[PDB]
Design a protein around this ligand. Structure first.
Ligand code: FES
Ligand code: FES
Ligand SMILES: [Zn+2]
Ligand SMILES: [Zn+2]
Ligand SMILES: [Zn+2]
Ligand SMILES: [Zn+2]
Lengths: 101, 103
């Protein structure tokens, strides 16, 4: 079972650290939702949840996978397929995008 | 201690939604209570993150709070229940059995 949390926080223009929504995170969340709902093996063992800020803004979009405790930063919508394949199904975090475990 | 990450569903929905929402069931005050505690309390602030979320799909048992990496899901959480969760589980390591809906 894996629980993926995608920060979809938005903030007005002048916020110094920006926000994950401004960096494209609402498209990352939608991509995860589409993949999980259309994949038989993931649909019954994975939950995707949109969240407010998780305090790692400069590294957004931020995605955290529990219970593993893997934090990903700078996730682009194009990277969602790799995370789903290699980590959510494969059990191997996408090293290139990990910012913490 | 270690590190705990608390997620509080703060999703709100228009009045007609069959399953209601956690915000309709008082979850934003539960989130606010966690925030007030996690920081007026040093031991907690340093080791805990409280994050508000959208629906976690267990609406009829809300307000829904999930603590990771433990994987403890709580339901029907009231603001008044926050101190017990903070003391027993977030500081003490022991989930509040009466509110657990899943581990
Ligand atoms: S806005 Fe997403 S981690 Fe802060
Ligand atoms: S509205 Fe909170 S779990 Fe659905
Ligand atoms: Zn509805
Ligand atoms: Zn409302
Ligand atoms: Zn109190
Ligand atoms: Zn018992």
């Amino acid at each position: 079972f894996k629980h993926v949390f995608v920060c979809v926080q938005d903030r007005p223009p002048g916020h110094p650290q920006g926000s994950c929504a401004q960096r494209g995170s609402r498209e990352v969340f939608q991509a995860f939702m589409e993949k999980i709902q259309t994949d038989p093996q993931l649909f019954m063992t994975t939950v995707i949840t949109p969240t407010g800020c998780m305090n790692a803004c400069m590294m957004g979009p931020v995605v955290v996978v529990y219970p593993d405790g893997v934090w990903y930063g700078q996730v682009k919508p194009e990277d969602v397929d790799e995370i789903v394949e290699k980590h959510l199904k494969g059990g191997e975090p996408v090293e290139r995008l990990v910012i913490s475990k």
